[PDB]
Amino acid sequence: DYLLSAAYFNNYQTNRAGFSKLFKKLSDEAWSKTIDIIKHVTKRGDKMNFDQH
Amino acid sequence: TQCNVNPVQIPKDWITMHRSCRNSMRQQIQMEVGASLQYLAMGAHFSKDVVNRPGFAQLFFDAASEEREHAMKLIEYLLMRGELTNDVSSLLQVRPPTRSSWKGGVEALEHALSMESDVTKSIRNVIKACEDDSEFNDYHLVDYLTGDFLEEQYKGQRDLAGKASTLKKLMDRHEALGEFIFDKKLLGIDV
Amino acid sequence: TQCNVNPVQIPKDWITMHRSCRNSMRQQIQMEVGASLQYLAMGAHFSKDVVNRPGFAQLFFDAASEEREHAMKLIEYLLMRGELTNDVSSLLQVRPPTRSSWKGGVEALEHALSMESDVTKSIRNVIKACEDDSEFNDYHLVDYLTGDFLEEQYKGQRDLAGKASTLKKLMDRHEALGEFIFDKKLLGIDV
Amino acid sequence: TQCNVNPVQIPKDWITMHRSCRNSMRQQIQMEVGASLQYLAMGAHFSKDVVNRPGFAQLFFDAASEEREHAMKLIEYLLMRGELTNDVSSLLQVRPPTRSSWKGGVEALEHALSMESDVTKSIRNVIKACEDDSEFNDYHLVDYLTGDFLEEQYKGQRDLAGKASTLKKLMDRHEALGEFIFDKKLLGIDV
Amino acid sequence: AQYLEEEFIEDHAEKIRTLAGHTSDLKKFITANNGHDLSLALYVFDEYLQKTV
Ligand SMILES: [Fe+3]
Ligand SMILES: [Fe+3]
Ligand SMILES: [Fe+3]
């Protein structure tokens, strides 16, 4: 979701490099945390289920 | 209350992508994201304590991040051409991947090879749509997809195919030790 | 008196460009030179004491020099292919540019965007002429124009379009201060 | 006795080159090797004590090694695409070159220019075969041959043509001293 | 609990405070002096984000 906001603020009409950078950072951090949590789930002996609610 | 600024308009003749090509690019973006999610599931599988192949896990988590970068590069290309001033929310949809388990490293490598093979075919179809539109041959995008994206695809396929061949030869009599050693080699560790 | 050396002849089969493609390249060379002259006039305008936008002046003088380099690259390509052993004097003509004044930075940026858009369309037409000649598809030149020239064109258009959008939003209520700040940012100066 | 491992099979959908294109590539590989052998003979000729043009000898031995590298690059491309799992032995044949003597540096440079001109035409024919196969337009290989191989060909032809023109102008009255000086310049020696 | 405390919880407070502050700044640009400086303020604010994100 954050990646799409970063893209939107980087279109030629909006062209807000600062807003785009803010969302790109939020996106990169959330992506990195996704992998970290998956690794923690397996570290504790469980298995990741991508359809878990 | 007026929370935003009344939009302005600047010249638009420079915005030239045509619909068929643009739609094929949008579909490719979703395909790259789908591939990133499928690789995340492979990384998760090999990270399990009962599977314990950290070399394969890292290989696939790295592949997941690379596919996410591919999606971002295609999005940046559209933005550079003047697109995505709207219809951004509908570009992507995150959904659980189709497969979540593999019998061993060989099955995962062969599945990855097949996924890459599908992506290569899809990129070639985007190239066809962008080049053969009777109203506009998008020379630059065709060149970009051919020289950057296909280059990465062919090298990647050869790499995965070689890994699969090498490991598969060890499966008839050395399934456990063969995969164990191969897995550590993926981490740069010579036992 | 004999002031020159009697010419010699060497094999010429390697010289293969065809007429339609060569003529389109010659026309493109004149177009690049024309663009360099129009950018010089923009640089001159923003250099005036009563306009005083040194950031815009530098932006356009830099663009003028870049267009001159584009003309030189096309000329070098023809020379590499064995052309221009004659008909060199008629390649270019320096003439006063059509426009010499702009209301403000936005008008100049929009005019530059339109000039670049015209150049992009013209390069695509050179590509068509060079690729579709029924007697000779000039693969290498088409590739050169697509990967080098169009690459620079699309990036340049996006850059100018973004600058125009950003500055134009400031014009309804902040024409003077908005342009002043934007101009200094072009010089890398954050006030 | 079982001296080898029973072969394994992995997915093959990723292997997509078509026959006409592949056969043209195989023929090009033999052509590059043939060119390397002809350049070796030129290097040998200028190395003779009675010819004694070390600059020309080095120029042609370097060209021979470069043609061998061209052959290797084409072979590597086929391997990357999944080819050459068989029919490798028949790819090349080493045979004595057709010519072994030249009257002087100009004749050798003109012969080299003609050889390069033939290679350029042959590569353009491989491109045509690979691009125009009604069943499969090999976008990536066409792009590779155009951007890498043709690039080297056109620069090389212009270089040889210039060398031939420069030296040939000296032949009507300064055959010995002109070639001697030109030869040392090839070694980077200004007498 | 400690994993959440260390890897998520501490940093969430900083991010939320930062974003809340950004909305307060924009709210003021929109309301003060009848919102007359809005377009220039959004430009200045975006430049500020480029330097601080
Ligand atoms: Fe990808
Ligand atoms: Fe130009
Ligand atoms: Fe060669």
DSSP C103: S
Counting ligands in written order, the one closest to the CA of C148 is: 2
Q: Indicate the resolution in Å.
A: 1.9
B172 touches chain C (CB under 8 A): no
- In this structure, chain B runs to a length of 191
Subunits with 3+ C-beta pairs closer than 8 A to A: B, C, E
- What is the three-class DSSP state of A13? coil
Mutate to test the interface with B, among D75, D81, D140, D146 (most CBs of B within 10 A): D140
Give the distance, in angstroms, between the CA of residue D36 and the centroid of all CA atoms in the same chain: 6
Contact A1, E32 (CB under 8 A): no
Gap from CA of B150 to ligand 1 centroid (Å): 9
Mutate to test the interface with C, among D121, D157, D175 (most CBs of C within 10 A): D157
Place of tokens 């499969």: D136
Q: Is there a binding annotation on residue D111?
A: no
Check CB contact under 8 Å for E43 and C185.
no
Provide CB contacts within 8 A for C102, sequence distance 6+.
Answer: C42, C45, C108, C111
The radius of gyration of chain D's CA atoms, rounded to the nearest angstrom, is 21
Sign of CA dihedral C94, C96, C101, C106: negative
Check CB contact under 8 Å for A15 and C166.
yes
Check CB contact under 8 Å for A40 and E3.
yes
- What is the three-class DSSP state of C117? helix
Gap from CA of B32 to ligand 1 centroid (Å): 5
> Nearest residue of D to residue C5 by CA position?
D169
Kindly list the residues from chain D whose CB atom is less than 8 angstroms away from the CB atom of residue B113: 10-11, 14
Q: Chain E: give the shortest CA distance to residue B3, in Å.
A: 6
The radius of gyration of chain E's CA atoms, rounded to the nearest angstrom, is 15
Question: From residue B111, how far is each of B65, B80, B98, B108, D80 by CA, in Å?
Answer: 18, 34, 12, 5, 19
Check CB contact under 8 Å for C14 and D161.
yes
Gap from CA of C70 to ligand 2 centroid (Å): 5
Chains B and C touch (3+ CB pairs under 8 A): yes
Q: Which CATH architecture has domain C1-191?
A: Up-down Bundle (1.20)
Q: Is there a binding annotation on residue C70?
A: yes
Structure tokens belonging to residue D123: 């590569």
DSSP A11: S
> Nearest residue of C to residue A9 by CA position?
C162
Check CB contact under 8 Å for C11 and D110.
yes
Would you kindly state where each structural domain of chain D is located, as residue ranges? Answer: 1-191
The span from the CA of C115 to the CA of C113, in Å, is 5
Q: Chain E: give the shortest CA distance to residue B11, in Å.
A: 20
Structure tokens belonging to residue B18: 């045509």
Query: Rounded to 5 degrees, what angle do the CA atoms D96, D102, D105 make?
Result: 125
- What is the three-class DSSP state of E2? helix
Check CB contact under 8 Å for E40 and C185.
no
Nearest to D114 among C13, C140, C143 (CB): C13
Q: Is there a binding annotation on residue B32?
A: yes
- What is the three-class DSSP state of C116? helix
Nearest to B5 among C113, C158, C169 (CB): C169
Alpha helices in chain B (DSSP H): 19-47, 54-80, 105-132, 139-144, 151-168, 175-186
Nearest to C146 among B16, B82, B140 (CB): B140
String of DSSP letters for chain D: ---SPPP-----TT----HHHHHHHHHHHHHHHHHHHHHHHHHHHHHSTTT--HHHHHHHHHHHHHHHHHHHHHHHHHHHTT--SS--GGG------S----SSHHHHHHHHHHHHHHHHHHHHHHHHHHHH-TT---HHHHHHIIIIIIHHHHHHHHHHHHHHHHHHTTTTT-HHHHHHHHHHHHTT---
Instruction: Tell me the technique behind this structure.
Output: X-ray
Check CB contact under 8 Å for E49 and A22.
yes
Nearest to E48 among A18, A33, A36 (CB): A18
Kindly list the residues from chain C whose CB atom is less than 8 angstroms away from the CB atom of residue D172: 6
